[PDB]
Short mmCIF file of N, CA and C and ligand atoms in Angstrom, two decimals:
data_model
loop_
_atom_site.label_atom_id
_atom_site.label_comp_id
_atom_site.label_asym_id
_atom_site.label_seq_id
_atom_site.Cartn_x
_atom_site.Cartn_y
_atom_site.Cartn_z
N UNK A 1 96.72 119.29 134.42
CA UNK A 1 97.89 120.14 134.53
C UNK A 1 98.09 120.55 135.97
N UNK A 2 97.75 121.80 136.29
CA UNK A 2 97.79 122.24 137.68
C UNK A 2 96.94 121.35 138.57
N UNK A 3 95.76 120.93 138.08
CA UNK A 3 94.86 120.08 138.87
C UNK A 3 95.43 118.67 139.05
N UNK A 4 96.01 118.10 137.99
CA UNK A 4 96.72 116.82 138.11
C UNK A 4 97.83 116.92 139.15
N UNK A 5 98.63 117.99 139.08
CA UNK A 5 99.71 118.19 140.03
C UNK A 5 99.21 118.31 141.47
N UNK A 6 98.10 119.03 141.66
CA UNK A 6 97.54 119.17 143.00
C UNK A 6 97.03 117.83 143.51
N UNK A 7 96.42 117.02 142.63
CA UNK A 7 95.94 115.71 143.07
C UNK A 7 97.07 114.73 143.31
N UNK A 8 98.21 114.89 142.63
CA UNK A 8 99.41 114.15 142.96
C UNK A 8 99.85 114.46 144.38
N UNK A 9 99.83 115.75 144.75
CA UNK A 9 100.16 116.11 146.13
C UNK A 9 99.18 115.45 147.10
N UNK A 10 97.90 115.44 146.74
CA UNK A 10 96.89 114.79 147.59
C UNK A 10 97.17 113.29 147.72
N UNK A 11 97.53 112.64 146.62
CA UNK A 11 97.87 111.22 146.68
C UNK A 11 99.07 110.97 147.59
N UNK A 12 100.08 111.87 147.54
CA UNK A 12 101.24 111.72 148.42
C UNK A 12 100.87 111.85 149.89
N UNK A 13 100.02 112.83 150.21
CA UNK A 13 99.51 112.98 151.57
C UNK A 13 98.78 111.71 151.98
N UNK A 14 97.92 111.19 151.09
CA UNK A 14 97.13 110.00 151.41
C UNK A 14 98.03 108.80 151.69
N UNK A 15 99.07 108.62 150.86
CA UNK A 15 100.05 107.58 151.09
C UNK A 15 100.71 107.73 152.46
N UNK A 16 101.11 108.96 152.81
CA UNK A 16 101.70 109.20 154.12
C UNK A 16 100.73 108.86 155.26
N UNK A 17 99.46 109.28 155.16
CA UNK A 17 98.50 109.00 156.23
C UNK A 17 98.32 107.51 156.42
N UNK A 18 98.56 106.75 155.36
CA UNK A 18 98.41 105.31 155.42
C UNK A 18 99.72 104.62 155.79
N UNK A 19 100.80 105.36 156.00
CA UNK A 19 102.14 104.79 156.18
C UNK A 19 102.39 104.36 157.62
N UNK A 20 103.34 103.43 157.78
CA UNK A 20 103.59 102.82 159.12
C UNK A 20 104.00 103.85 160.17
N UNK A 21 104.67 104.94 159.78
CA UNK A 21 105.14 105.84 160.82
C UNK A 21 103.99 106.53 161.55
N UNK A 22 102.80 106.57 160.96
CA UNK A 22 101.64 107.11 161.64
C UNK A 22 100.65 106.03 162.07
N UNK A 23 101.01 104.74 161.94
CA UNK A 23 99.98 103.70 162.09
C UNK A 23 99.40 103.63 163.50
N UNK A 24 100.18 104.04 164.50
CA UNK A 24 99.73 103.94 165.87
C UNK A 24 98.52 104.83 166.14
N UNK A 25 98.37 105.94 165.37
CA UNK A 25 97.21 106.81 165.57
C UNK A 25 96.31 106.89 164.34
N UNK A 26 96.76 106.40 163.17
CA UNK A 26 95.93 106.47 161.96
C UNK A 26 94.94 105.32 161.91
N UNK A 27 95.18 104.24 162.64
CA UNK A 27 94.41 103.02 162.43
C UNK A 27 92.89 103.17 162.60
N UNK A 28 92.33 104.02 163.48
CA UNK A 28 90.85 104.11 163.54
C UNK A 28 90.20 104.64 162.25
N UNK A 29 90.99 105.22 161.33
CA UNK A 29 90.52 105.89 160.12
C UNK A 29 90.78 105.07 158.85
N UNK A 30 91.31 103.87 159.00
CA UNK A 30 91.68 103.07 157.84
C UNK A 30 90.45 102.59 157.07
N UNK A 31 89.38 102.20 157.77
CA UNK A 31 88.24 101.51 157.16
C UNK A 31 86.93 102.13 157.61
N UNK A 32 85.83 101.88 156.87
CA UNK A 32 84.53 102.41 157.29
C UNK A 32 84.21 101.89 158.67
N UNK A 33 83.65 102.77 159.49
CA UNK A 33 83.14 102.38 160.79
C UNK A 33 82.08 101.32 160.60
N UNK A 34 82.28 100.19 161.24
CA UNK A 34 81.29 99.11 161.34
C UNK A 34 80.59 99.34 162.67
N UNK A 35 79.52 100.13 162.67
CA UNK A 35 78.96 100.56 163.95
C UNK A 35 78.47 99.38 164.76
N UNK A 36 77.78 98.43 164.11
CA UNK A 36 77.28 97.28 164.86
C UNK A 36 78.43 96.47 165.46
N UNK A 37 79.50 96.22 164.68
CA UNK A 37 80.65 95.46 165.18
C UNK A 37 81.31 96.13 166.38
N UNK A 38 81.34 97.46 166.42
CA UNK A 38 81.98 98.20 167.51
C UNK A 38 81.02 98.52 168.65
N UNK A 39 79.76 98.09 168.54
CA UNK A 39 78.77 98.41 169.54
C UNK A 39 78.30 99.86 169.56
N UNK A 40 78.45 100.58 168.45
CA UNK A 40 78.14 102.01 168.44
C UNK A 40 76.77 102.14 167.78
N UNK A 41 75.76 101.75 168.54
CA UNK A 41 74.45 101.63 167.93
C UNK A 41 73.77 102.97 167.71
N UNK A 42 74.41 104.06 168.11
CA UNK A 42 73.93 105.41 167.82
C UNK A 42 74.74 106.12 166.74
N UNK A 43 75.77 105.48 166.20
CA UNK A 43 76.69 106.20 165.32
C UNK A 43 75.96 106.78 164.11
N UNK A 44 75.11 105.98 163.46
CA UNK A 44 74.42 106.41 162.25
C UNK A 44 73.21 107.29 162.56
N UNK A 45 72.84 107.41 163.83
CA UNK A 45 71.88 108.46 164.16
C UNK A 45 72.56 109.83 164.20
N UNK A 46 73.82 109.88 164.65
CA UNK A 46 74.56 111.13 164.84
C UNK A 46 75.34 111.55 163.59
N UNK A 47 75.93 110.59 162.88
CA UNK A 47 76.77 110.83 161.70
C UNK A 47 76.03 110.52 160.40
N UNK A 48 75.69 111.56 159.62
CA UNK A 48 74.95 111.32 158.38
C UNK A 48 75.82 110.89 157.20
N UNK A 49 77.12 111.20 157.19
CA UNK A 49 77.99 110.98 156.03
C UNK A 49 79.30 110.36 156.48
N UNK A 50 79.31 109.05 156.72
CA UNK A 50 80.56 108.40 157.11
C UNK A 50 81.64 108.58 156.06
N UNK A 51 82.89 108.62 156.54
CA UNK A 51 84.09 108.69 155.70
C UNK A 51 85.29 108.10 156.40
N UNK A 52 86.18 107.55 155.58
CA UNK A 52 87.37 106.86 156.06
C UNK A 52 88.40 106.83 154.93
N UNK A 53 89.65 106.51 155.29
CA UNK A 53 90.75 106.61 154.32
C UNK A 53 90.67 105.57 153.19
N UNK A 54 90.11 104.39 153.44
CA UNK A 54 90.00 103.44 152.33
C UNK A 54 89.00 103.93 151.29
N UNK A 55 87.97 104.67 151.72
CA UNK A 55 87.04 105.25 150.76
C UNK A 55 87.70 106.39 149.98
N UNK A 56 88.48 107.23 150.66
CA UNK A 56 89.24 108.27 149.98
C UNK A 56 90.16 107.63 148.96
N UNK A 57 90.82 106.53 149.35
CA UNK A 57 91.73 105.86 148.42
C UNK A 57 91.00 105.31 147.21
N UNK A 58 89.83 104.67 147.42
CA UNK A 58 89.09 104.14 146.27
C UNK A 58 88.64 105.26 145.34
N UNK A 59 88.16 106.37 145.90
CA UNK A 59 87.74 107.52 145.09
C UNK A 59 88.93 108.10 144.31
N UNK A 60 90.11 108.17 144.95
CA UNK A 60 91.31 108.64 144.26
C UNK A 60 91.66 107.71 143.11
N UNK A 61 91.63 106.40 143.35
CA UNK A 61 91.97 105.43 142.31
C UNK A 61 91.00 105.54 141.14
N UNK A 62 89.73 105.82 141.43
CA UNK A 62 88.66 105.90 140.44
C UNK A 62 88.50 107.27 139.78
N UNK A 63 89.35 108.25 140.11
CA UNK A 63 89.30 109.59 139.51
C UNK A 63 88.00 110.30 139.86
N UNK A 64 87.41 109.97 141.01
CA UNK A 64 86.19 110.63 141.45
C UNK A 64 86.44 112.10 141.80
N UNK A 65 87.57 112.41 142.42
CA UNK A 65 87.87 113.78 142.84
C UNK A 65 88.24 114.63 141.63
N UNK A 66 87.51 115.72 141.42
CA UNK A 66 87.83 116.59 140.31
C UNK A 66 88.89 117.61 140.67
N UNK A 67 89.11 117.87 141.96
CA UNK A 67 90.14 118.80 142.38
C UNK A 67 90.55 118.48 143.81
N UNK A 68 91.60 119.16 144.25
CA UNK A 68 92.17 118.95 145.57
C UNK A 68 91.18 119.31 146.67
N UNK A 69 90.34 120.31 146.43
CA UNK A 69 89.35 120.71 147.44
C UNK A 69 88.38 119.57 147.77
N UNK A 70 87.94 118.77 146.78
CA UNK A 70 87.01 117.68 147.15
C UNK A 70 87.73 116.60 147.95
N UNK A 71 88.99 116.31 147.60
CA UNK A 71 89.78 115.38 148.40
C UNK A 71 89.88 115.88 149.83
N UNK A 72 90.26 117.16 150.00
CA UNK A 72 90.42 117.69 151.35
C UNK A 72 89.09 117.67 152.09
N UNK A 73 87.99 117.97 151.39
CA UNK A 73 86.68 117.97 152.03
C UNK A 73 86.32 116.60 152.59
N UNK A 74 86.67 115.53 151.87
CA UNK A 74 86.39 114.18 152.37
C UNK A 74 87.27 113.86 153.58
N UNK A 75 88.57 114.21 153.52
CA UNK A 75 89.44 113.93 154.67
C UNK A 75 88.97 114.70 155.91
N UNK A 76 88.58 115.96 155.72
CA UNK A 76 88.11 116.74 156.85
C UNK A 76 86.76 116.23 157.33
N UNK A 77 85.91 115.76 156.43
CA UNK A 77 84.66 115.16 156.87
C UNK A 77 84.93 113.96 157.78
N UNK A 78 85.88 113.10 157.40
CA UNK A 78 86.24 111.97 158.27
C UNK A 78 86.65 112.46 159.67
N UNK A 79 87.53 113.47 159.73
CA UNK A 79 87.93 113.96 161.07
C UNK A 79 86.74 114.61 161.81
N UNK A 80 85.94 115.43 161.12
CA UNK A 80 84.77 116.07 161.73
C UNK A 80 83.77 115.04 162.27
N UNK A 81 83.56 113.93 161.55
CA UNK A 81 82.67 112.88 162.07
C UNK A 81 83.19 112.37 163.39
N UNK A 82 84.52 112.20 163.48
CA UNK A 82 85.09 111.76 164.75
C UNK A 82 84.88 112.78 165.86
N UNK A 83 85.09 114.07 165.55
CA UNK A 83 84.87 115.11 166.57
C UNK A 83 83.38 115.27 166.91
N UNK A 84 82.50 114.92 165.99
CA UNK A 84 81.09 115.09 166.26
C UNK A 84 80.62 114.00 167.19
N UNK A 85 81.11 112.78 166.97
CA UNK A 85 80.55 111.66 167.70
C UNK A 85 81.08 111.60 169.13
N UNK A 86 82.34 111.98 169.36
CA UNK A 86 83.02 111.70 170.63
C UNK A 86 83.22 112.91 171.55
N UNK A 87 83.28 112.66 172.86
CA UNK A 87 83.64 113.71 173.83
C UNK A 87 85.03 114.24 173.58
N UNK A 88 85.29 115.51 173.91
CA UNK A 88 86.58 116.12 173.54
C UNK A 88 87.77 115.48 174.24
N UNK A 89 87.55 114.75 175.33
CA UNK A 89 88.63 114.08 176.04
C UNK A 89 88.82 112.64 175.60
N UNK A 90 88.14 112.20 174.53
CA UNK A 90 88.23 110.81 174.12
C UNK A 90 89.58 110.53 173.47
N UNK A 91 90.08 109.31 173.69
CA UNK A 91 91.35 108.86 173.12
C UNK A 91 91.39 108.99 171.60
N UNK A 92 90.27 108.63 170.94
CA UNK A 92 90.20 108.65 169.47
C UNK A 92 90.24 110.09 168.95
N UNK A 93 89.77 111.05 169.75
CA UNK A 93 89.84 112.45 169.33
C UNK A 93 91.27 112.93 169.34
N UNK A 94 92.04 112.53 170.35
CA UNK A 94 93.47 112.83 170.35
C UNK A 94 94.16 112.19 169.14
N UNK A 95 93.76 110.96 168.81
CA UNK A 95 94.36 110.30 167.63
C UNK A 95 94.00 111.04 166.36
N UNK A 96 92.72 111.41 166.21
CA UNK A 96 92.27 112.21 165.07
C UNK A 96 93.08 113.50 164.95
N UNK A 97 93.23 114.24 166.06
CA UNK A 97 94.00 115.50 166.07
C UNK A 97 95.45 115.29 165.64
N UNK A 98 96.08 114.21 166.10
CA UNK A 98 97.47 113.99 165.70
C UNK A 98 97.56 113.73 164.19
N UNK A 99 96.66 112.89 163.67
CA UNK A 99 96.67 112.61 162.24
C UNK A 99 96.25 113.83 161.43
N UNK A 100 95.32 114.64 161.95
CA UNK A 100 94.93 115.85 161.25
C UNK A 100 96.05 116.87 161.23
N UNK A 101 96.89 116.90 162.28
CA UNK A 101 98.06 117.77 162.26
C UNK A 101 98.96 117.39 161.09
N UNK A 102 99.21 116.08 160.94
CA UNK A 102 100.00 115.61 159.80
C UNK A 102 99.38 116.09 158.48
N UNK A 103 98.06 115.87 158.34
CA UNK A 103 97.33 116.19 157.11
C UNK A 103 97.37 117.69 156.81
N UNK A 104 97.00 118.54 157.78
CA UNK A 104 96.84 119.96 157.49
C UNK A 104 98.20 120.57 157.18
N UNK A 105 99.25 120.15 157.92
CA UNK A 105 100.55 120.77 157.66
C UNK A 105 101.08 120.40 156.28
N UNK A 106 100.88 119.15 155.84
CA UNK A 106 101.36 118.83 154.49
C UNK A 106 100.43 119.35 153.39
N UNK A 107 99.10 119.32 153.60
CA UNK A 107 98.14 119.89 152.65
C UNK A 107 98.44 121.37 152.39
N UNK A 108 98.86 122.10 153.44
CA UNK A 108 99.16 123.52 153.30
C UNK A 108 100.34 123.78 152.36
N UNK A 109 101.19 122.79 152.11
CA UNK A 109 102.31 122.96 151.18
C UNK A 109 101.89 122.85 149.72
N UNK A 110 100.60 122.82 149.45
CA UNK A 110 100.11 122.57 148.10
C UNK A 110 100.77 123.46 147.07
N UNK A 111 101.25 122.89 145.96
CA UNK A 111 101.79 123.69 144.85
C UNK A 111 100.72 124.59 144.22
N UNK A 112 101.13 125.81 143.89
CA UNK A 112 100.26 126.79 143.24
C UNK A 112 101.06 127.90 142.55
C1 4K4 B 1 88.29 98.09 162.30
O1 4K4 B 1 89.19 98.92 162.98
C2 4K4 B 1 89.20 98.73 164.36
C3 4K4 B 1 89.96 97.76 164.96
C4 4K4 B 1 89.90 97.63 166.34
C5 4K4 B 1 90.79 96.51 166.89
O2 4K4 B 1 90.45 95.38 166.81
N1 4K4 B 1 92.08 96.89 167.44
C6 4K4 B 1 92.57 98.30 167.53
C7 4K4 B 1 93.85 98.51 166.72
C8 4K4 B 1 94.85 97.39 166.76
N2 4K4 B 1 95.67 97.54 165.48
C9 4K4 B 1 96.25 98.87 165.46
C10 4K4 B 1 97.33 99.10 164.41
N3 4K4 B 1 98.30 98.00 164.32
C11 4K4 B 1 99.22 98.23 163.21
C12 4K4 B 1 97.60 96.73 164.17
C13 4K4 B 1 96.64 96.47 165.34
C14 4K4 B 1 94.29 96.02 166.92
C15 4K4 B 1 93.15 95.94 167.95
C16 4K4 B 1 89.13 98.46 167.14
C17 4K4 B 1 88.37 99.45 166.53
C18 4K4 B 1 88.44 99.55 165.15
N4 4K4 B 1 87.70 100.50 164.33
C19 4K4 B 1 87.40 101.88 164.63
N5 4K4 B 1 86.83 102.54 163.62
C20 4K4 B 1 86.51 103.80 163.78
C21 4K4 B 1 86.76 104.44 164.96
C22 4K4 B 1 87.32 103.78 165.99
N6 4K4 B 1 87.66 102.49 165.81
N7 4K4 B 1 87.52 104.60 167.17
C23 4K4 B 1 88.48 103.90 168.01
C24 4K4 B 1 86.32 104.87 167.97
C25 4K4 B 1 86.06 104.30 169.21
C26 4K4 B 1 84.90 104.61 169.91
C27 4K4 B 1 84.00 105.53 169.40
C28 4K4 B 1 84.25 106.14 168.17
C29 4K4 B 1 85.40 105.77 167.45
C30 4K4 B 1 85.72 106.50 166.13
O3 4K4 B 1 85.47 107.67 166.04
N8 4K4 B 1 86.41 105.86 165.02
C31 4K4 B 1 86.72 106.66 163.84
C1 4K4 B 2 85.70 100.08 170.72
O1 4K4 B 2 87.06 100.42 170.68
C2 4K4 B 2 87.99 99.36 170.67
C3 4K4 B 2 87.57 98.05 170.54
C4 4K4 B 2 88.51 97.02 170.51
C5 4K4 B 2 88.01 95.57 170.38
O2 4K4 B 2 88.30 94.79 171.21
N1 4K4 B 2 87.17 95.13 169.26
C6 4K4 B 2 86.70 95.99 168.11
C7 4K4 B 2 86.97 95.35 166.75
C8 4K4 B 2 86.42 93.96 166.65
N2 4K4 B 2 85.42 93.92 165.49
C9 4K4 B 2 86.05 93.50 164.24
C10 4K4 B 2 85.07 92.88 163.23
N3 4K4 B 2 84.20 91.84 163.77
C11 4K4 B 2 82.89 91.87 163.17
C12 4K4 B 2 84.05 91.83 165.22
C13 4K4 B 2 84.16 93.24 165.81
C14 4K4 B 2 85.79 93.47 167.90
C15 4K4 B 2 86.65 93.70 169.14
C16 4K4 B 2 89.89 97.27 170.64
C17 4K4 B 2 90.33 98.59 170.77
C18 4K4 B 2 89.37 99.60 170.79
N4 4K4 B 2 89.72 101.03 170.90
C19 4K4 B 2 91.06 101.62 171.08
N5 4K4 B 2 91.18 102.97 170.94
C20 4K4 B 2 92.36 103.55 171.10
C21 4K4 B 2 93.51 102.83 171.38
C22 4K4 B 2 93.37 101.48 171.53
N6 4K4 B 2 92.17 100.90 171.37
N7 4K4 B 2 94.59 100.72 171.84
C23 4K4 B 2 94.15 99.34 172.07
C24 4K4 B 2 95.60 100.60 170.77
C25 4K4 B 2 95.91 99.45 170.02
C26 4K4 B 2 96.91 99.47 169.05
C27 4K4 B 2 97.65 100.62 168.79
C28 4K4 B 2 97.35 101.75 169.52
C29 4K4 B 2 96.35 101.73 170.50
C30 4K4 B 2 96.15 103.06 171.24
O3 4K4 B 2 97.11 103.73 171.45
N8 4K4 B 2 94.81 103.55 171.60
C31 4K4 B 2 94.76 104.86 172.25
#
């Protein structure tokens, strides 16, 4: 009921984050970090709980999220992992912040 409706809002946000109008800055978050492929041989020493939008999408499709808060927690974990790993002046941090602005402003419109 209310929870289904809230997760519908989450699915709409997720669709938007994956949409072409944000693709120029959303792309680092589309898939799990392949640390070896990117040469980030310290990534898994620093980041204990990787997260990315394709994993959020699979969990949404599979009904893993019991409420909107767990969905939001995973999206914020993905952004926090990016802020944890990188210097504050890094290009990817600016990209994360722009996509997080999109996320937080629409998440705040949650029906209640
Ligand atoms: C698998 O996704 C990646 C692709 C590429 C790559 O080959 N590119 C970059 C994007 C470009 N596309 C852009 C969109 N366009 C529609 C199609 C073409 C094509 C050329 C480069 C990196 C990719 N993955 C990626 N994962 C996690 C990172 C990270 N980078 N950012 C940039 C980081 C960089 C350094 C240190 C940390 C990170 C990081 O935090 N994340 C989340
Ligand atoms: C480590 O970070 C990057 C790496 C590469 C790259 O050449 N790769 C990484 C992906 C590729 N792997 C794929 C799988 N395979 C096993 C082999 C390894 C190997 C070659 C390319 C881009 C990287 N980071 C990056 N950050 C911000 C951008 C930007 N570019 N530019 C290029 C953009 C490209 C498209 C749209 C926007 C941007 C952009 O604005 N920024 C700021």
